[PDB]
Amino acid sequence: MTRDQNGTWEMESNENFEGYMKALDIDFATRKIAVRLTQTKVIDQDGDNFKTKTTSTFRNYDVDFTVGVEFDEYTKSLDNRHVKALVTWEGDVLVCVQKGEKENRGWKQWIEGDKLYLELTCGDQVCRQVFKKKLV
Ligand SMILES: CCCCCCCC/C=C\CCCCCCCC(=O)OC(CO)CO
């Protein structure tokens, strides 16, 4: 029973964020800033209802969803694309498929210990992020 992802989580590693961004066609001036930033993830979860915020000094991104309920996602101030998104549980891993113009786009997010793991995929690029839970 590790489905409870509530908390504030601070990034400690970010592997291949460059390649993921390039796969999304982010221009190199934007990538040059974005690759350097420490991200924070704030998750407010009530059962299968999620409200999430990913924040940095450069850009913030909010996405809210209910597990199992397809929704329209506009990735505003990221790559600015429209996708149909569905989040499901695979065991205690939260799995998102983002169907749209990019093939094999989505993410997977799960807890181990005091860490939150997030693997972002686009095409043949995978970015692996790890966040540490912030205290009180
Ligand atoms: C926002 C902080 C970084 C902003 C700088 C990046 C700008 C360059 C363009 C694209 C990179 C998109 C990468 C972030 C993916 C969104 C996070 C996300 O959807 O996470 C899920 C799972 O946590 C939310 O529930």
Curated annotation (Swiss-Prot):
Protein localization: Cytoplasm
Binding residues annotated for all-trans-retinol, in chain numbering: K41, Q109
GO molecular function: fatty acid binding; molecular carrier activity; retinal binding; retinoid binding; retinol binding
Keyword Zinc-finger in annotation: no
Main location: cytoplasm
Cited SUPFAM superfamilies: Lipocalins
Key words, A-Z: Cytoplasm, Retinol-binding, Transport, Vitamin A
Tissue expression per record: Higher expression in adult small intestine and to a much lesser extent in fetal kidney.
Xref: InterPro entries: Calycin (IPR012674), Fatty_acid-bd (IPR000463), ILBP (IPR031259), Lipocln_cytosolic_FA-bd_dom (IPR000566)
Record flagged with keyword Metal-binding: no
Domain of life: Eukaryota
Disulphide bridges: none
Domain notes: Forms a beta-barrel structure that accommodates hydrophobic ligands in its interior.
Function: Intracellular transport of retinol.
Protein's name in the database: Retinol-binding protein 2
Organism field: Homo sapiens (Human)
Phylogenetic placement of the source organism: Eukaryota, Metazoa, Chordata, Craniata, Vertebrata
Chain's gene name: RBP2
